[PDB]
Each structure stands twice: as C-alpha cells, then as structure tokens.
Design a protein around this ligand. Structure first.
Ligand code: NA
Ligand code: NA
Lengths: 211, 209
C-alpha cells in the first residue's frame, strides 16, 4: 500500500546526435536508493552521475523525480535504460521500471558522386554513376533526378554497407547509363536523406558524350 | 593506463546459511565500483545499505571490493557482475565476466506416505511412497530392504517443481507384491540432495496375510 512505486516510467525514445534527451522516472513514497542502468550498467546513485560527463539525474527530490538527462546526445547513448530503486529500510520491495530503448540517429556525410564533377562518356558505351552517402544511422535513402528534376527509378541499383561499428551505414546508388547522343552536357543529381536529416542533400555530375 | 581486473568472480555454489564471497580486485582503479545482481545495481558504498546481508569487503589499497554475502538465502541465487565506471580522465569502464551463484536448499525430512506400517494381503499388489519435500536440487531417493540391499527394481522416481520454481519435491514409489516372507520385515528410503550433510531415512514395516 505505502510501498514505493513508480508514478512515471521511461518509454522508448529516438534522438539525433547533439540533441538533449530526458528519460522520465518518478517515484511515489520513495524508500530505497534510485539508480539508472544503461545496458545493465549502473550509472551511479548521486544526481551528478560523476563518471558520465553528459548524464545527470534532474528533477526535485520532493517530487520523487530522478529523470535521466542526456546532453549532448552521442552515438554511444544508443542503449537500453532502466530506472531502479533498491529495497527500503523496512524491507519495502525493490522496483524496476519498464526498459526504455534510446535510438540515436546520425546524419550522414555529404553525398558524393564517385566519378566526380564530369564524366566523359561515349555514345552507347554503358557507364556507371555512383552516389554514396557515408555513415548515416539509419542508412540514407537515395533518389536520382535528371536534368529537369524528373525522378528516375529505372537502371538504378541501391545497396547498403554497414560500417565496422555495426550501427552506421553507407548507402550507395548506382545509375547505369547508356549515353545517348542527346545526353551531352546534361546533368544527373542524387538526393540523399536519412531520418536524422532536416531535408535532403544533393550532389551533381555533368555528362559528356562523343559520337 | 586502463583500469583492469586482477581478479574476476567465478561461478560458486553455496548452501543456505553459509557465507559466500565473490572476488573482485581492480588494478589502476579510476572509476567507481559496483556489483550487479541479475542486472540490479547493488550500490556503490561498501556497506551496501538496502541489502542487509551484503557488503563489499577487502581494502581500498589492494583494489579489493569482493561481494560478501552472509547468511546466504535462496534469494541470492542469481547472476553477478563487478563493474567499474569511467575514470575522471576518460579511462573506459570495465565489466567483469558474469558469475552465477547457485544456492542449495536441504529438503525436509523424508516421509513414507503409508506411514508406520502396511497391513497387506499376499499377492495383493501394494505401493510404498517416499517423499522428500522442498530440496534444491531435488533429493535423490534410494530404497533398501531389511538386510541393507539397495532395491533397483519396480521403482518409479518422479520430481515435482514447487510453486517458487526453484525448489523441488522428490517422490519415489516402490511396487511390492506381498509375500509370506515379507511379514514383519522393513523397507527404508534414504533421501539426500547435494545440500545435505548426509542422507536422511524413513522406515516402514509391512505385515502380510
Ligand atoms: Na554526470
Ligand atoms: Na548491506
């Protein structure tokens, strides 16, 4: 009845690198010691959380509020969190909150076309144009457009390559082009965007054609 | 220079009421040390308030923060890890290997369900049941005749989990065909689990008609 219990428990959240994120935890009739774990690692029991320079427990003691405040968010924060309270002095039972997953989003590097600024093609001599978006979490989507902003979906092969950290991804989109004679000095552009991006980013290449 | 372990805790087995100590020693300790029990943080002060039977023993000088438990209870059966947080200069955290503590529980005294005596009739098939309640693990049960011979035939040994899904009740049934010779003879069961210091016995006398 009077045993310590949660008024609020953390829920899954998603946040971009550099952002602030606060995982809620509030206790009614708090009796034991409160602590957050991160992937089952105890973060510590004092509000300043020494050892973790970007973490602190904020809120007032009177309200039982020990929310885990993270700023700035970094990729290393992508993990499972839990709010815990140890048993009370009279044996009031320990309590453990719902686990809360923090998903951290990472904007990719600027998209780049491997072939550079200009490609010198020959009519009917098939050629590859590769757009690359390095290190996004999640992988960036890539759209191709022609000289007039018409989206292409033909002759395009999109692939994803995980980075060694197994969290970030490099996205690649290959446009296989059969250079028509009219294609001379036309442009092709790729547009890359992941869910961390505020809008898409673009790269462009000019195509020259002989014959 | 990284903080690292000099000693990590290993799996141990202990009987309820015993003292058990899980080693953890740190070299170049920079961060704060803490134990977890089934991923619950036990606290970062040596007296571990909130856990009346736990404390971290050893000297700071030796980097020793072994988890001391006394008296051991069934609730201690769990997986433990020794953790040290990042240091002031960014020395990375360390986590020990996990150590499982297996707690053993002696069963209650064995009992024969038919009790003190069986008044039987010749060739009228009868069953004698020995029961050992509440052992972790389940007690093994051996049947012996009046001469002290282990009976290995006509025996059904079963194990039933208890409500807490940790302790077990062991039962062993001996199928007997009453014979004139079996008059006023004795049957004993001997029950023992790994927690027991020795076996415990119950005895039944059988009369034939
Ligand atoms: Na901190
Ligand atoms: Na304690």
């Amino acid at each position: 009845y009077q045993n310590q219990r949660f008024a609020m428990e953390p829920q899954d959240q998603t946040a971009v690198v550099g952002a602030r994120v606060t995982l809620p935890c509030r206790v009614i009739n708090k009796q034991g010691t409160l602590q957050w774990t991160k992937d089952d690692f105890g973060l510590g029991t004092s509000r300043d959380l020494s050892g973790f320079e970007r973490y602190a427990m904020v809120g007032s003691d009177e309200e039982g509020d020990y929310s885990l405040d993270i700023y700035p968010v970094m990729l290393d924060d992508d993990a499972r969190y839990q709010c815990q309270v140890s048993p009370g002095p009279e044996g009031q039972p320990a309590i453990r909150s719902t686990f809360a997953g923090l998903t951290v989003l990472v904007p990719p590097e600027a998209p780049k076309i491997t072939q550079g600024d200009v490609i010198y093609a020959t009519e009917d001599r098939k050629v590859e144009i590769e757009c690359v978006s390095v290190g996004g979490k999640p992988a960036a989507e890539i759209t191709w457009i022609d000289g007039l902003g018409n989206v292409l979906t033909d002759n395009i092969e999109y692939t994803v390559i995980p980075l060694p950290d197994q969290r970030r991804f490099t996205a690649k989109s290959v446009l296989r082009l059969t250079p028509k004679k009219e294609h001379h000095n036309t442009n092709f552009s790729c547009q890359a965007q992941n869910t961390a991006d505020r809008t898409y980013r673009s790269a462009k290449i000019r195509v020259e054609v002989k014959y």
